[PDB]
Amino acid sequence: NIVLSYGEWPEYCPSPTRPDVSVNRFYTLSTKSWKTESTGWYWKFPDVLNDTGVFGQNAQFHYLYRSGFCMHVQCNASKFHQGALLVAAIPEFVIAASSPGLYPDFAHTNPGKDGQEFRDPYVLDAGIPLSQALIFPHQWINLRTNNCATIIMPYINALPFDSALNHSNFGLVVIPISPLKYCNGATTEVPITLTIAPLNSEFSGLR
Amino acid sequence: NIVLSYGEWPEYCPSPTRPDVSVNRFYTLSTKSWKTESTGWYWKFPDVLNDTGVFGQNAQFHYLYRSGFCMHVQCNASKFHQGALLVAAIPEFVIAASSPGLYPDFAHTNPGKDGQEFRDPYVLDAGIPLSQALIFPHQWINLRTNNCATIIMPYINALPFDSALNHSNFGLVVIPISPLKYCNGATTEVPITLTIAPLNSEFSGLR
Amino acid sequence: NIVLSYGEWPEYCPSPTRPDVSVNRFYTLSTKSWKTESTGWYWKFPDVLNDTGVFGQNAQFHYLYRSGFCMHVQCNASKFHQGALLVAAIPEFVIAASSPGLYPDFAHTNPGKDGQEFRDPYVLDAGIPLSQALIFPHQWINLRTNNCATIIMPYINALPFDSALNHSNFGLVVIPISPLKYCNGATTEVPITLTIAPLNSEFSGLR
Amino acid sequence: TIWYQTNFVVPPDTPTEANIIALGAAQKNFTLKLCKDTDE
Amino acid sequence: TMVGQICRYYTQWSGSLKVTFMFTGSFMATGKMLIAYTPPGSAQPTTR
Amino acid sequence: VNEASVEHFYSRAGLVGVVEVKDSGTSLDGYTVWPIDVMGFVQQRRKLELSTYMRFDAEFTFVSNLNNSTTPGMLLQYMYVPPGAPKPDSRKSYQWQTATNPSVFAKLSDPPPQVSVPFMSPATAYQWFYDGYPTFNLQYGQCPNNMMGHFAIRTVSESTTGKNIHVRVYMRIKHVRAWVPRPLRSQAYMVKNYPTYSQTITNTATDRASITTT
């Protein structure tokens, strides 16, 4: 029940250090609080791990980098909560500013391991309409049916290898479509947990 | 899990127009509101369709008529509602008046597509005791177990063919035995839906 | 002795309701009175049946329609009457007005089941000359030889299916060439009867 | 058209207002012709 | 919709469409909805 | 077994009508017509309305006598007016001679006359409950296809005899077949030919003190 982004398992570039399960472990990021009025959140893929653990070391010390990912969202709501999230993975997520101050601040183009809340969920902060974001790989989190969503996204870039810090490959977006409503007397903030695990990772050019 | 009235699938009279799936479709009647104090409802079988759609046309324009039926009741209660209905099909349901004005009014002998609420559920409006109505084909709708009940009733009449308007073959009765009780704060009126679908229908004598 | 319009029996469009002999019966229209000075009559083919019987129902309630026809004229004159009729079937009979008020009235473009008497039989009410109308499928009704004429006309239209009410396929025309003369003391008005029977009819898009 | 067939039934302490989401698409037999410019 | 936007880049289109609905209420919430579809000939039905 | 069978349940010919050929006093008729009605008494109607459709042929027997239980040699005619024929209007009626009306001439001082009557109905079976209207409010639920014809009785005599003759008609249902069992009646029978009941419903069971009382 895991969506395969464009239907290609991530593969090593045939012929550069190939790390091991010491790096290819499950990084469980912090949990964000899905409230009623909350608009959503997004993470830049390679940027979200550039400062945590051995993967952060490899990214911040090598020169070329390529890796797949097995992003995994789960949210633990009760059976009396109602709502619906849209989680998709957007290649080349180019965040754009919103002029009435013409380019996005760095805190909005690379939010880090904490994510950024959307300013314009309707237009995805990038002018494109949300109603069409489903053209990307996605999975629906509808509380009455399922509460998990796994996306396997391979390496999509023009060049074979690229810098892990200058250019972020894609961006994981999770937006509430049907807002979270609940009667009085429940946990007023469903928690959303995002587990990431690199796949078929590679580096080159140490120090 | 469908009860077979007297254990005989409806069959064409061997040898008259035999209609098709254009007529043998599922007519979904209106939904009645099962409230606490409600006493029940009954429909005369051929009379309930004599004014709706192509079957109504065939009945109101031909002379002889015979058809089976696949009456189907369903009620959508919550899991906190409690109650129990008795649905049975009574051949030759002869409604009787209740003198202290000696014969039932036509609105009570042929109620139409809207059904009539019972005046005396204990005695079935016909002198016979409800505690024995189970001698007919029936199914129990107990909210803690099931919420649907299908009765296939073939053609039971003395003559081979009969008028579709003068003489109604049987009557579908649905009575609440255990009344509907529910705590404060629920949908105060469970809806009951009745779907009918003629089977092996026949007519003769057009215009 | 039946003329086959362009030599093609009407055929079902290979793959939509296909009616039966309940619809494919002989509709006998009213009889018009062929008098001396009478100029002729014409009927639009699908329009002549759009308000009579089950075919009228199917036309006035479906969306797409295609059918052949077996138009059949007969006239019961005595052996002392003399005259000659020309009956032909004209595809795409576009009636035109006659300016000295620039387009024909609807009562002249779709006369109905009663037909319309020609205003200009010489020029067929359409500018084209009668002397050439024989280029269409036709049969001669010459009282000294025959008194019947059958035309089987298949479905001729650009699109596969069309509206039965907006666009009339063809038009049946019957004109007296040699006028009706008779000595004193005979039935002064020969009757002309027009029997129609649809063939390989089809509809689609009910309600 | 979408019609309320029945009422909206919930057990106690549960929201009484939901949302239906409609998704459109085209089957495999869809075709286009005669490309032209757009109207934004 | 994606198809709605692409068809504006063409002149003619013909085919069969599908429309998926999705309920997003509490799990405990039950009910019944009737979805009808009227062909292009007729007008909108006025009553259920 | 074989003792609660449906055939044995309707056997044992029983009284269905006590008709009286009045010929004395203020009733110098000498004849009487008794329309056949199986559902005459309640004890029989309740057993018959157990089933909906029923098919049988009867074996009528006439037990006649005077009012002092004597049985002189008087001569009687019993005529069976079939369903659909006219019934007589007096002692001397043209109807008393229509050879299509079967008749049985038996004296009083003879064993009871006995005659079988076949299944006389246009339908497939007699129908006690008819949810419908004939003649395609006092006409609802009344099937006409249950009529079994009349029984007319007269003393073959010239003038009045001055002797009332009571007749007891017994009937035996043979070859009973029944369909669609129904719940046995629970309320009183208020009116013949109609299932009407009283506003005061009577419980089917007798009421004890508490649900924990025996």
Side-chain angles (χ1 to χ4, degrees), chain B residues 164-177 179-188:
Chain B
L165 297 86
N166 297 271
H167 160 249
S168 291
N169 288 124
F170 62 93
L172 181 63
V173 62
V174 52
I175 319 165
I177 317 298
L180 180 82
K181 273 184 290 261
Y182 54 88
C183 205
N184 178 23
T187 319
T188 54

Side-chain angles (χ1 to χ4, degrees), chain A residues 79-84 132 140 142 144, chain E residues 1-2 5 22-29:
Chain A
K79 206 168 296 298
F80 297 89
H81 281 120
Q82 75 165 17
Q132 304 178 194
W140 279 91
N142 194 11
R144 67 178 300 104
Chain E
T1 80
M2 189 65 171
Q5 286 301 330
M22 173 178 300
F23 188 73
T24 79
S26 89
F27 169 88
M28 306 290 295

Side-chain angles (χ1 to χ4, degrees), chain C residues 60-70 72-73 75-102 104-138 140-165:
Chain C
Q60 270 197 168
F61 280 87
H62 293 61
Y63 186 59
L64 311 182
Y65 139 71
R66 52 166 298 114
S67 313
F69 285 100
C70 176
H72 182 143
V73 194
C75 77
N76 316 286
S78 181
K79 206 168 296 298
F80 296 89
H81 281 120
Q82 75 166 17
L85 285 160
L86 169 67
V87 47
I90 306 183
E92 300 299 326
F93 196 21
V94 172
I95 292 292
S98 89
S99 89
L102 303 87
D105 191 2
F106 181 82
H108 291 79
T109 46
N110 299 89
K113 66 177 182 60
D114 38 355
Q116 185 76 205
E117 301 189 357
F118 271 92
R119 184 210 40 249
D120 279 334
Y122 192 18
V123 300
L124 267 175
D125 289 356
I128 68 177
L130 169 59
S131 43
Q132 304 178 194
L134 273 67
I135 187 54
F136 300 121
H138 61 259
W140 279 91
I141 296 186
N142 194 11
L143 294 186
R144 67 178 300 104
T145 300
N146 53 336
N147 44 328
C148 80
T150 43
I151 311 183
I152 302 180
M153 164 76 89
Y155 186 79
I156 289 87
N157 194 17
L159 292 87
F161 284 76
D162 211 338
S163 141
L165 297 86

Side-chain angles (χ1 to χ4, degrees), chain C residues 1 3-19 21-44 46-50 52-70 72-73 75-102 104-138 140-177 179-188 190-206:
Chain C
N1 64 93
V3 308
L4 210 51
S5 194
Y6 305 100
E8 281 189 53
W9 294 84
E11 305 317 314
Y12 291 90
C13 179
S15 88
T17 169
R18 299 162 183 252
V21 309
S22 44
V23 180
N24 315 342
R25 43 168 289 178
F26 288 83
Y27 298 89
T28 292
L29 269 41
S30 158
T31 68
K32 320 214 74 60
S33 61
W34 183 7
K35 303 179 182 180
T36 78
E37 39 80 21
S38 314
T39 61
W41 316 263
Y42 67 96
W43 297 271
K44 300 306 185 173
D47 183 69
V48 80
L49 300 179
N50 279 349
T52 64
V54 180
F55 187 81
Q57 299 289 335
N58 298 124
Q60 270 197 168
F61 280 87
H62 293 61
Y63 186 59
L64 311 182
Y65 139 71
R66 52 166 298 114
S67 313
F69 285 100
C70 176
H72 182 143
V73 194
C75 77
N76 316 286
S78 181
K79 206 168 296 298
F80 296 89
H81 281 120
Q82 75 166 17
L85 285 160
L86 169 67
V87 47
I90 306 183
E92 300 299 326
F93 196 21
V94 172
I95 292 292
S98 89
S99 89
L102 303 87
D105 191 2
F106 181 82
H108 291 79
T109 46
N110 299 89
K113 66 177 182 60
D114 38 355
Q116 185 76 205
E117 301 189 357
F118 271 92
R119 184 210 40 249
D120 279 334
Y122 192 18
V123 300
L124 267 175
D125 289 356
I128 68 177
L130 169 59
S131 43
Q132 304 178 194
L134 273 67
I135 187 54
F136 300 121
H138 61 259
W140 279 91
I141 296 186
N142 194 11
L143 294 186
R144 67 178 300 104
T145 300
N146 53 336
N147 44 328
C148 80
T150 43
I151 311 183
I152 302 180
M153 164 76 89
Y155 186 79
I156 289 87
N157 194 17
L159 292 87
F161 284 76
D162 211 338
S163 141
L165 297 86
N166 297 271
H167 160 249
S168 291
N169 288 124
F170 62 93
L172 181 63
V173 62
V174 52
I175 319 165
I177 317 298
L180 180 82
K181 273 184 290 261
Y182 54 88
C183 205
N184 178 23
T187 319
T188 54
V190 191
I192 298 182
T193 309
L194 161 70
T195 291
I196 315 181
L199 287 182
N200 292 27
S201 159
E202 284 184 2
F203 303 84
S204 196
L206 204 157

Side-chain angles (χ1 to χ4, degrees), chain F residues 8 11 13 20 25 41 50 64 76 80 91-92 97-98 102 117 122 147 149 152 167 180 189 209:
Chain F
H8 178 88
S11 42
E20 183 182 359
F41 298 82
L50 170 61
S64 52
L76 280 177
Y80 166 73
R91 184 140 40 185
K92 307 304 190 308
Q97 312 169 0
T98 76
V117 171
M147 202 166 329
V167 174
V180 191
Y189 275 118

Side-chain angles (χ1 to χ4, degrees), chain F residues 10 22 30-31 33 37 88 96 112 114-115 126 142 149 165 168-169 181 193 202 209 212:
Chain F
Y10 289 97
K22 312 184 92 292
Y31 80 104
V33 175
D37 46 0
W96 286 113
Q114 188 181 241
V115 285
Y126 297 102
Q142 293 192 318
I165 312 183
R168 285 184 167 81
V169 196
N193 312 331
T202 82
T212 80

Side-chain angles (χ1 to χ4, degrees), chain A residues 28-44 46-47:
Chain A
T28 292
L29 269 41
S30 158
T31 68
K32 320 214 74 60
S33 61
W34 183 7
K35 303 179 182 180
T36 78
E37 39 80 21
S38 314
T39 61
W41 316 263
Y42 67 96
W43 297 271
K44 300 306 185 173
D47 183 69

